[PDB]
Write a protein that binds this DNA or RNA. Sequence first.
DNA 1: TTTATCAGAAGCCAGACATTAACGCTTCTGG
DNA 2: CCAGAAGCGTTAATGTCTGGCTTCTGATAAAG
Lengths: 375, 374, 381, 356
Amino acid sequence: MKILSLRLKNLNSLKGEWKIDFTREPFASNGLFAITGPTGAGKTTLLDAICLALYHETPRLSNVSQSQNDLMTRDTAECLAEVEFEVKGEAYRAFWSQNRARNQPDGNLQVPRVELARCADGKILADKVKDKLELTATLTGLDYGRFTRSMLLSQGQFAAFLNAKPKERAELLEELTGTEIYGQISAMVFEQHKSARTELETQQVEDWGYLNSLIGSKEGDKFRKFAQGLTLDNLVHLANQQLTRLHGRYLLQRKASEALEVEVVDTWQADAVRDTRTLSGGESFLVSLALALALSDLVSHKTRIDSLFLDEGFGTLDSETLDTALDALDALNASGKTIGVISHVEAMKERIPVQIKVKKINGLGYSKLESTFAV
Amino acid sequence: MKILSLRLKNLNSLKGEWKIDFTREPFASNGLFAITGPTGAGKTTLLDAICLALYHETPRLSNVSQSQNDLMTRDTAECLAEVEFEVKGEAYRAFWSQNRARNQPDGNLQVPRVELARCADGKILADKVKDKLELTATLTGLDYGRFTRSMLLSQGQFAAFLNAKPKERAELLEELTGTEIYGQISAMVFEQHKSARTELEQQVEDWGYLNSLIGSKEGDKFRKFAQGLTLDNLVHLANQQLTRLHGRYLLQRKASEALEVEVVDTWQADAVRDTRTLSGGESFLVSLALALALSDLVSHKTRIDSLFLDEGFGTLDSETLDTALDALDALNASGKTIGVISHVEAMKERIPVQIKVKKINGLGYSKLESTFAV
Amino acid sequence: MRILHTSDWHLGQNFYSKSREAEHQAFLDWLLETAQTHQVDAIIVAGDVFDTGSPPSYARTLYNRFVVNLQQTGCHLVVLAGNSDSVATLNESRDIMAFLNTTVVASAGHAPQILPRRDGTPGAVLCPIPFLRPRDIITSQAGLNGIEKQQHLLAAITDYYQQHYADACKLRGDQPLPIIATGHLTTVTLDAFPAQNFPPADYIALGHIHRAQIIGGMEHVRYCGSPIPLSFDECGKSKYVHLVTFSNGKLESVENLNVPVTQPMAVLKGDLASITAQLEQWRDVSQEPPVWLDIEITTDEYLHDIQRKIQALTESLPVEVLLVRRSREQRERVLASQQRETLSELSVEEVFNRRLALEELDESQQQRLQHLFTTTLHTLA
Amino acid sequence: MRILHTSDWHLGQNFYSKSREAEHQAFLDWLLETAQTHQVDAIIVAGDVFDTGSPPSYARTLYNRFVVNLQQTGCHLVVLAGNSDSVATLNESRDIMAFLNTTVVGHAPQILPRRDGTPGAVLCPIPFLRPRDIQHLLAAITDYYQQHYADACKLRGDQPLPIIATGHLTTVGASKDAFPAQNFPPADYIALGHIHRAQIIGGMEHVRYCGSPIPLSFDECGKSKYVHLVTFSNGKLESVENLNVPVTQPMAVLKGDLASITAQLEQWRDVSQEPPVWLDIEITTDEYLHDIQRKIQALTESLPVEVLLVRRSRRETLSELSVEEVFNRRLALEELDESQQQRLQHLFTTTLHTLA
DNA sequence: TTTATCAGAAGCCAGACATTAACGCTTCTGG
DNA sequence: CCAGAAGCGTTAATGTCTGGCTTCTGATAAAG
Ligand SMILES: Nc1ncnc2c1ncn2[C@@H]1O[C@H](COP(=O)(O)OP(=O)(O)O)[C@@H](O)[C@H]1O
Ligand SMILES: Nc1ncnc2c1ncn2[C@@H]1O[C@H](COP(=O)(O)OP(=O)(O)O)[C@@H](O)[C@H]1O
Ligand SMILES: [Mg+2]
Ligand SMILES: [Mg+2]
Ligand SMILES: [Mn+2]
Ligand SMILES: [Mn+2]
Ligand SMILES: [Mn+2]
Ligand SMILES: [Mn+2]
């Protein structure tokens, strides 16, 4: 799941077939790299091309299909993002590409030709879209949302896992384990019960109904929330150790409610039971960081992933918490996880010298970086 | 509307009673003022009492009542927040206070008490909550929902206006100017069609075509065709606040049924592109421009003389941040007292007026200066 | 000197989309009826004479017909505004109703007046004080506290009563006339009033409490209560318009005439079979006013469409449901499982059994439901 | 026989969120004073009395303080209903006012007793004939005044008492379909309402419109604010005196561009008028309406005046246009054709009045 | 303590879109 | 000077889902 190389062409302001690889010597050293530059130079685009290629979906946009390709750099004909990565020791390659009508800067946007192929085999493992999605799901072990809230953390969306509605948190926790059957059991309880209750236009339907408020009815909810509570307990047991490795401020624990929620605990107070919606900004960023690390480490046994792409939030710390957080991240890159971070903070220059430093062409509306990476 | 003073006690990490003032020897200029301090040691809280005392609803917590009051700090008996806001020359007051049962730190949480008192005569106007909110709506002319996007700007919210559901943004537009009849007609017409359909369980043609054209529950359709003109008026004020702020972009109402603003790209020769495809710094600056224009839309009715905004300046660029700050100070050529809370060290060198917030040494609380202590 | 002390009329109150229109009207003739029977001279209604400051338009016609039909008797009437009504609604008709012996005093700071008798002689010394809005007596200042704002109000109303009583001492002078003072407040969570701070008056009618009760052992301070039941906790109770005859300028008697209840209401506790038995008492007997009910169901079972089971009962009966409540407030979530288990190792048979041990059910339905549950596991297999 | 004739009070009127409190309160004392001057028999108000069916809570307090002050005059009061006033807004105190010589209104006609107890005149109390309560709408209104004239003629018989006619309606011919002015029954007098412009209708003196006693809108800034004092001669009309009310709140409808407007603004400079003079400024530019008012607030601060409205009667905003035109603008993508656009136009104005 | 009143959640209908599968236009390109 | 193939660009059936909306039980504030 560690990316080995990325190659894009007209992503946003990265015009002209810019590629990077992490098999290069500055990335072959440790695996901790930063990105800086002026804002709007495409740092989120550089971190966006990989999730575009692996899932045809970005954190910024919604869906880059035949209609409404808002991605492609203004007035060019084709845009393409291509990645070579690894799972379980062996490499694969995803390749997403899109043309205009007739190689002109404007026209009908065509269907995106994609592929997913095992590198060093020449085997086109997947050709169309849906097969590519499901095959990279089973072949990476991560879904779309599990990438964008446990491995890639986009800027200003780190409060997604902490502050989602409990349905789309139970979704992630259900999918994370190999226990997706509850989302079929609780749906089929409603399937039996609505059929039995529309058969009354019977004490048996009363027994179905007494089941039907005892477990989930349409989708998962109820029984699903009851089931993932133990996985949430396991996850906060992991993340508690993760966070006290990180900063010795708040422990976490689960809470006694139907909604799958996590309350915090204050070590200094020694008796704190508040909801997470009243955390501070920096502590909410550290809770999302440590929580994401715990979620990533929970599925350590199967398809273990090793990458992290924090987009922003380090500015919300200072020279008194940011330094401690980066010093704890050094223990993570000392382990096999190879993280990456976009940062505007100049104080992380001494921390990370491995940069993908970008530039702007004098306010024209494009960008560029070190020409040792470009083709 | 500006703020003349502020008092609080045991709100969050700020233990004890504190009282800042906006008519002193500091703040003798109407210039922008910063608030420094360590991260997460009472920084958005001084801008949270402003929301709390005026509308009982923080940006973070949804509601505070006799149940579900996470706000006041642990092992404290009560909390209060007290502003002195001024509109059209005359001062006012607000006083939202809440005690615990039998003044014990581990007790039940009693009914909150509010005032909305006048400061000159001393008389009060609304001793109950359901009257205080609707007598602040008359007074400021801006409702709490409008205040969240057209006055104050909270941390990680600058996606409030431009990433909202079109019902939400349209409703906000209809709450500022115009009249509520432009969706009330839709609600009444939905009732007409519901009645003429429950009858029939050209009679289709009665509320068939009209219902399809303009008519939905709670005023959707016709309210959106109404605000499809107010947005086209607001985008011009957005442009005029934007060009002095950030000259690379212009805005334009996109000709569509769901009212969505649209960036006009001058450096790519009038390229049109959707508004979600913006950088972090561009989204922060365009949301600042849109909120400043949104406050200056109802400036003809009610003067709105204050603008607090939290961290978006780590997000901005260190060269064009000087342009943005000089444009902000150019907006300080009016009486708009602009509070700014961030962490950019070059910016806090530019901003003189600093309300320094010292974090306690392992105590678990925070403090403030001796001038504002009480 | 006789007075009729009622309060808490709560006119125009909607009651779960139902009204108290004829329910007040059949009281208001009776209040008019007992006037000439007991030869009273001045009725006092001390507070809550409207539900809301903009009442429905008939809710004045219940009140306006009352004040005109009082002029057949020619007896006086004092109306005090309560906490519920906007003060500007009652001062719509303060000035005109002086022509009709009806001193509707809505605002604070009114002057003390002398009650006349039927013959024209002065009958009683009145200290009318309506519900003190806190704005009308006190001004707020900066630098206050949370608790202190409640205590600063309490001292202000206290010395307002001491001031308004002292005016009556000049107005009574040396004549043997009784002092009647009103008010709309509570007495003996420290939001009340100490009755020892009430003035040394001869009789103090009051309001705002619906249970008709003496307070503090002083018989001359009487919450008269509502004239009709407005809730389901005091539905089965009785209502008493207080009749206070005076003797030689002092107090004689506190008579409590009951009210003929025209709209019957009752409350039921328990579970569905207990509700089935309590509904059986209305089977043979008939009701010309349809009786209303509260059904506080304390059930445990699922009870598919519990409002339809109630609707199935009272079709051919003269009983009207108006509300139905259940104890649906409960918690349900997996425990720690001794802090060690994994979800992949626990089978679906475990966590379903872990989910049923949280309820009440013991034997019969359980061995029915577990068969019903295991049919779903197999029909995917 | 002196009878005052007022109409269209519209009490508690919302006026761009400004009030008509002190306009009426400086009128109502004047109204009884002229009645106190000339020793009137009775006053009649020809409808449009309150603004809406749910008047504001202060709007009664002017109306009741009028009536308690009327008791020190001893004069009879007859109150007619209007078009905007419900039955339920005037069934509030329908029999409170019976004890204060104040008859309020499907009713039999009555006699107006004089100040000295003698029967003075004959009144035909005619409230608004709602077609929900009563071509065919024109059919029943036409013969009803023939139906009620025999009720007017036979209630007196040979008695030498004059008849006055009431009502609150609209009439063809009078500048602002309706009731025909030539079909009125020839009684001794007809008072009439719902027309806020004061004028004689048809050329017959015994039928009248007294208009509103105050200006209502800016456009109706006419100086013809009158109350009609009538005099009767033993069963016949003598004359009608139009009495000028005082003015208290001046308005000024300034037009043109900013060149002609700012010249007019110095007319109220340094005069120190004790009520703030109201405006209806009519700008004619192409500039934006939300920003043309920016210059005005500095210009209005120096003058002792207060602006009320700015309009361009020639982009556009929502506080400028009307509800049909945006509805007509909403028909840009809708196939108006012939029948489809007419039904929508006719059923729309039905829907707009359902919220009215 | 109980009673309107709004606010949020879960489920239902449906049109709007994403995707896949099949049908003409252009272009090397060979003689 | 061109026709066959090869690819490329185009349209018509169908599967998921995002958005009203509605039906419901939950919260909130207020008069005992
Ligand atoms: N479709 C497009 N056409 C032209 N320019 C674009 C397009 N999409 C993005 N851009 C430019 O690319 C930049 C993206 O910046 P971004 O990577 O979001 O900055 P950050 O990394 O600070 O979030 C913006 O400056 C924007 O102007
Ligand atoms: N329930 C609570 N009681 C007391 N203090 C709290 C509570 N919840 C959070 N805090 C503290 O209050 C402070 C609020 O952080 P603050 O600086 O206001 O946020 P931000 O960093 O976004 O401005 C934090 O230090 C946090 O530890
Ligand atoms: Mg960024
Ligand atoms: Mg903050
Ligand atoms: Mn009451
Ligand atoms: Mn009360
Ligand atoms: Mn009128
Ligand atoms: Mn009229």
